[PDB]
Design a protein around this ligand. Structure first.
Ligand code: 94S
Ligand code: 94S
Ligand code: 94S
Ligand code: 94S
Lengths: 317, 317, 319, 317
């Protein structure tokens, strides 16, 4: 029996007998994704080239306006905005949203995969809303996931029950449930990182990657893939299994990916799909942030693979 | 002044006072590309999931039927077919087409970019048409290029005058010229190959890669990218500069990519854009093929970079 | 601030503190409307013509609404112009609402690309019996909501409920219905009459006179304009936008008219009244007719209040 | 075998061994139709209503810009512009185009069918082009037709060979040939006119209309339809047979429809499909215009039905 994103959310929202504020947020966000996807596929570009005589910025304004107008949000953190946005009081609701509205948008001249990442928190403090409400640890996530604008446009939603994937049919503007309660492979055969920083790698990364190119039990070497747009690399990891690594180098001693709206949402999706996500020292979701644009090193993916790396990490102290 | 692929080809076709058979072929191919794009973006997928109670095969049939019915082709070589297809005589025309109808479609489960690669030859003899007509070297190409099914749909077309890029506007089904006469950077900063099989690297490849991660002059190391879908990795190389390598080792002395419908059209686009493409021993376009599904190693991209690789390659011989 | 149909329905659903079953109904219906529009615009017809070497549009439309409603968990009885007997939803998918619909009205003339539409009416199941066709035999007064999708130059969804009539434009780049006309109200008097004057030979005498009074005013004012698309959804919606009167009246060859009460006349009458208009059979208001069979017909004259009145004067003038 | 509008125009154009200037015209015109369809279906209206915080005028600018840039036009007459536009010398070509880019658009608030009507004449003089070049009779048409934006978008193209109908598949932006070499019914069962102006009907019109409601041979009365958009009413007449009448009354002794870009193109389709079009006094195509915006009464459709009208017209003088 067929199921849609809006219909899955409403069925789940009634089963839990909640108020609907979260559904309204999800519906508003889903609508922005459909608009962003329309622009990413360059629909309507002919008028820009004078047929009748800022893609990351447009994405940002789409998500800002659609979330502000859902009456369901109070603090919004975006990669595009230096400070958190504090929703004006008349439109204020109970939720905090952190998002990268167009991840990979720097490599968009090459039509690389791009994506939207989002994380949803229930405001915890009872103070007047401020940036501090967006500083919760990943454990506190109520919902998170991403839209991948690839060969097709897909939405991955992870909440308490698990992870579900919806394929956007652009013919009707509706998201079709195509993968119910997805689970990552226990062990993959692919490693994913930018090996250009090999000169700046921590030795454990060097040992684990060396173990993938020349396996010690003389098994088959892993394949390498690295798109360089995080949604694309993480999503492949989810669908095919394996391990993704953006560790700390010298240009980024605290890692390069942003914790609030890049690492934690992927870490939540991974964990709710049976995978693991670590900074090296601790699980990603346990990190308590202090700044909205702070970075974190991240290694995530299949349980056996992330565990194997963790053994290598302890070996080097 | 606004310009489309259909309008552009007619302009070049009149300026050259040709018969129109080539323009008819390109228009048919472009229409097949738009039809492929709609399915890759999963338009109408709602009906496959029972809303009222094969993707590379469909691609192959679209190009085949659109080429056969253009009245401009006589022999068609496709990745999907063991033997070359001979157009029935009533629909027979003066051109030979080699294509991969959907390259990278094996990784399409994760929505990575996919593409169609095509190369066009003029039939040289007046014999009865046979596979012998497909075995020209890349030097003989009249037009060649690819469609990238990425974040957007782009058609890159390389003919004698040079390389031009068209963006598909899906609201109107027209390819909008957005890049006239592209030329690749003289030297790039990205290396692109599957470093997972380092255990089996030919030694020159090993050394070339180490020099990219660890420059002896302590200049900047290159970044690594590898989508693992050929159209995507090559198009990025064209847009950003750099080098793509699917090289020969000893386990596969001829590489893995197919010469007729993968290596030659990319070599043509690269060379027509100021780039280089070698197998290590010779330019890709100089190879005289003996079997339509034969393999060839390929290293392509910026001239300074292909030259540097070849400098390392002669060293290990 | 921008507004979409899905967002508008949820707002009203919370404001009224309902269970959500009705919102789930309209959203599923909205989705079926979007899919119909995709097919009506012949998206993918190139594959139908062997571009790589399935049903008829009104059959497929019916399947879409049926399947989208059955799976909404908000319906128990479905009556369709396409199905002779009312459908009783299986118990697991069973809900508390009864739906009458015309899935593709006017589809007979679609070979000429005339406007076509989906019409729907939504009732609450009143009795506590096991659900049966009888639950569909409620009068139009009992409607919870009603409206129609018009697949014309654009695809517009008109939703009429107690609070009023709202119009949504389908933006196909994103597949969302955009609130574009809030709280619509029909003109008190129009300048258009709409009916099939080819069958004048069989006109009820009041109609013959009323049309003469619109073409040759006794008060020697300006004549009314004539328009008749012949697709009910198109003609009624124009009357809503420009004012005037629409007539599919009763003659002697068809003393009860030809249009169907449950899923054509009642939903159009419901929209008309919630927008300040009128809909009468001549003898009684359309919404007051108590149906005895799900496919029974009824004459309908609707449009601006003043114009339906002038007709009623002439109708009662003819005893 | 599948065939598109562009491929069909190229085939007939090659068979005639022409320069391509007409094919270039039609391709550019077809692309503007595709753009108007997208806007008329209100694609992208969500941004018009502030999702991130003029339709006939847009229609004209599209056709104007698309025709000027085809390098195939010299004089353009449009319903929207009081004087003919004279294409600038660098973009000049050998064809004259009269069009209504968005006919019936005054009724677009109710989502009535609208259309684009066009007629194409060869430049008459070799002098400096001027309005006199558009003042040719309908007999001189090289090609003419219309795009109907109704429940679907269809292109009706009438040239010397006949009339062919193309359906726009908006999923791929190509017009698909769906009716070859169409011919109108010899006699229909529908008449189509505005009986609201009955007060001023020419007596012949009154008598012919009475003859349709009350047949002397006690056959079936004709059915009545009148959408009020000429393209919609004319296309129905072509597809189902019957008669469309916008005749001369006392309120308008020369009719109200415009002869160059409404009556002349529709009469041509009618004649090329086996139908007829008269003003009452003469064939529409034989009227030589004196001013580009002159009006003409028109009665068109199936031949036997127009003949029955013409008998009554000759009877009444
Ligand atoms: C466990 O999942 C949930 C729990 C609560 C909520 S909620 O607080 O928004 N409640 C509601 O929406 N109630 C409703 N009433 C009428 C309607 Br129709 S929906 C939503 C979800 C779904 C999300 C996770 C996709
Ligand atoms: C140098 O470029 C070309 C040379 C020949 C050809 S052709 O053989 O197809 N001739 C024609 O098309 N003639 C026409 N006359 C009128 C029309 Br309208 S088209 C096409 C191209 C363009 C391609 C390569 C982009
Ligand atoms: C006044 O109109 C209504 C009355 C009841 C209903 S309802 O029974 O469906 N309740 C709900 O939907 N509750 C919800 N809870 C959470 C969410 Br989020 S929506 C809906 C409407 C809206 C109109 C447009 C149909
Ligand atoms: C009567 O049919 C025609 C007569 C002349 C012309 S034309 O002057 O445009 N010639 C050409 O286009 N030649 C070409 N050369 C290369 C190509 Br590829 S097409 C076109 C048509 C067909 C149209 C009207 C559908």
């Amino acid at each position: 029996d067929v199921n849609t994103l809006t219909r899955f959310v409403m069925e789940e929202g009634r089963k839990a007998r909640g108020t609907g504020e979260l559904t309204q947020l999800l519906n508003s966000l889903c609508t922005a994704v459909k608009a962003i996807s329309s622009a990413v596929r360059k629909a309507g570009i002919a008028h820009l080239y004078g047929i009748a005589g800022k893609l990351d910025v447009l994405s940002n304004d789409l998500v800002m306006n659609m979330l502000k107008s859902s009456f369901a949000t109070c603090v919004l953190v975006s990669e595009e905005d230096k400070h958190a946005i504090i929703v004006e009081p008349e439109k204020r609701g109970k939720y905090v949203v952190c998002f990268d509205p167009l991840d990979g948008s720097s490599n968009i001249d090459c039509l690389v995969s791009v994506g939207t990442i989002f994380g949803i928190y229930r405001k915890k403090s009872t103070d007047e809303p401020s940036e501090k409400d967006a500083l919760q640890p990943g454990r506190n996530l109520v919902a998170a996931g991403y839209a991948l604008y690839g060969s097709a446009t897909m939405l991955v939603l992870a909440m308490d029950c698990g992870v579900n994937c919806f394929m956007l049919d652009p013919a009707i503007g509706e998201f079709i449930l195509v993968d119910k309660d997805v689970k990552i492979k226990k062990k993959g055969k692919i490693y994913s990182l930018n090996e250009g920083y090999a000169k700046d790698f921590d030795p454990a990364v060097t040992e684990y990657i060396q173990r993938k190119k020349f396996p010690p039990d003389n098994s088959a070497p892993y394949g390498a893939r690295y798109v360089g747009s995080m949604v694309a690399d993480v999503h492949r990891t989810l669908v095919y299994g394996g391990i993704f690594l953006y560790p700390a180098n010298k240009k980024s001693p605290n890692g390069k990916l942003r914790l609030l709206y890049e690492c934690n949402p992927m870490a939540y999706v991974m964990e709710k799909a049976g995978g693991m996500a670590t900074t090296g020292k601790e699980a990603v979701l346990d990190v308590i942030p202090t700044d909205i644009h702070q970075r974190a090193p991240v290694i995530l993916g299949s349980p056996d693979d992330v565990l194997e790396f963790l053994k290598v990490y302890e070996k080097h102290s």
